[PDB]
Amino acid sequence: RSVLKNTSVIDKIESYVKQYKPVKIDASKQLQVIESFEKHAMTNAKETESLVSKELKD
């Protein structure tokens, strides 16, 4: 900022950056749908895991 001797805008866009300093948040919104996908996955997984454990000893 001390580079520009005729400054006039650096405090303006400085305040513009500090305005948008709470920039924008992300989304860990998935707490309803992702549990459904891991539910189907763990269901099929435990079914297959117990099935092959039975079929090996059979």
Added chain:
Amino acid sequence: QDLYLRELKDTKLAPSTLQDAEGNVKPWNPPQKPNLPELELQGPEALKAYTEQNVETAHVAKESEEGESEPIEEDWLVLDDAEETKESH
């Protein structure tokens, strides 16, 4: 040295009516105040992009979403197509 002295006094004073007192300019026939601080002051925003780049556009990102909360009618298709892959596997 009055050579140096009179040279530097004319050097100081002959544009001093262009810098110290703003009686704009006597030898230059176009006016000087509508060159740099009026026309060319918006020069860098006449040389760069106006109202998007210099105003800088603190812009909200497009909130990209999940698979729109529909397991069923596509998880069954994924399951049956996975059966078809394991047929081909």
